[PDB]
Task: structure prediction
Amino acid sequence: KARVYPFEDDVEVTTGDRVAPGDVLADGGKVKSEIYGRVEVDLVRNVVRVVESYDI
Amino acid sequence: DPVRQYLHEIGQVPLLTLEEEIDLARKVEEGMEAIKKLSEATGLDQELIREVVRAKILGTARIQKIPGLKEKPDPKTVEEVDGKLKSLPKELKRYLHIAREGEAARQHLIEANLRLVVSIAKKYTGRGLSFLDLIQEGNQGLIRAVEKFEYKRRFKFSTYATWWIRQAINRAIADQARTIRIPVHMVETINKLSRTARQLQQELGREPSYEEIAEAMGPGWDAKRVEETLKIAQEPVSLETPIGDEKDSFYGDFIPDENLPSPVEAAAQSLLSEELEKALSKLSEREAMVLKLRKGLIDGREHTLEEVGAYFGVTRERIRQIENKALRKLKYHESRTRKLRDFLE
DNA sequence: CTTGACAAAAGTGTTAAATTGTGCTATACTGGGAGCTGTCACGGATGC
Result:
C-alpha cells in the first residue's frame, strides 16, 4: 500500500526517510508527496515511493 | 523460554534460492564498490562513509549513542559527512543510494545463512556454552564470510559461510572454555593431544602410558610434556560442590585462610618486634642506629654501606666493621640471656 | 676507623628462542532437544 511519485533530476531525499503531506521528495522541489510515510528511492525505475507508515 | 524463542525467530524468514543468493551478492558488492568510487569523490576514506551508511540506515542516533563512553564522535566526525555529499551531482548521489541498498542486501543475506549457522552450531553443544551463547559467536563468523565472499566464485555461499562458522565457534571456545584463560595455540595443542590419546586408547585396547602416547605424538614430545599440559588442563573446581552424603555439607567453607595474619602470629610478630626493640639499647648509640639501616629497619628499606657512611660521615668500610662488632656484641648478649633463643622456625 | 684491590653480587644492554595472537580454509552442508514422576501448607496473581 503506497503512492508512487516518479522524479526526473537527482533527488532531495534518500532510501528510508520519513515525510508528511507538503514535502518535496525530489525533482528539485517540484514533485510533492501528500501522506505520512517512509520514502524509498528506487534508482533504476526512477521513482521515490511513499508507503503508508507512521514513524513509531 | 529464550531458546525456542530464537528457534522460531530464525524460521520467520525464508532462506533463499540460487537466484536470490546471486542477486544478494550482486547488489552487495556493487554497493561496496560504489562506496569505493565514493571514497574517490569528496576525498573520504574507504571505511568512513561505510559506517556512515550504517548511521543513516541501521537507524536514527541510536547506533552511536551508546557504544561505551568512547567509540567515535557522532556530532563531529559523522554529522558534517552526512551533509558533505548531499551537495553533490548525480553521479556521486547514485553511487550513494547504491551503497545504501547494497549494505541492506548484506543484512538480508546474513539472516538467511544465519538459519544455516543455527544448524551448524546446534551440532556443537557442550563446549561450555549452552546453546545460544555458542550459536551467537558462531553467527558472527558468517558475518565475516559475508563480506569476503564473491558471487563470481560460483559456489553456494553455504560452503564458505560454514567453514567460517566453525572458525568463529572454535576460536570462541578456545578463548573462553575453562574458567582459566588459555592462549589459542595452547588450546589447539591440547585438543590435539587428547585427540591422539583417544585414538590409541581405542586401538591399543587400553589406556596408554605417558611415554607411549607422547611418542605417538612425534619429535620432542615426552611423558613430561603430556603430564605438564595435562596438569594445566583441569579447570578450577567449584566451591559450591556439595560433599558427603548430605546437601548441607559444602566445599567452600572448608578452605583455611593463611593469606592473613593469625592472632598467634600477630602476637608473635609484635613479640619479636618488642623484644628486639629493647635488645636495641644495649648497643653503641652509633652502631645501633647504623644497624637499623643495613638490616632495613628504620624506613623498611635497607641502606647500603655507602649511604650509612654518607650518614655518619664515615667511610663504608667503617660501617662494615661497625656491623661486625655490633652483631657480635649482640651475639654475646643473646648467647647469654637466651630470651630470644626462640623464633628458630 | 681507612685506602687500595678484587671477588662476587648485581645492574644493564642487546638478542635468540618461545610464547601467543590472527586470519582463513570454497561441493555442499540452511527451524534444537531431552526427557520425569510417591508431598504439603499457605499466600497471591490469575483465569472463570
About this structure: Residues 182-235 of chain B form a domain with the Arc Repressor Mutant, subunit A fold (CATH 1.10.10.10). Chain B touches chain A at residues 56-57, 89-90, 93-94, 96-98, 100-101 (CB under 8 Å). The first helix of chain B runs from residue 2 to 10.
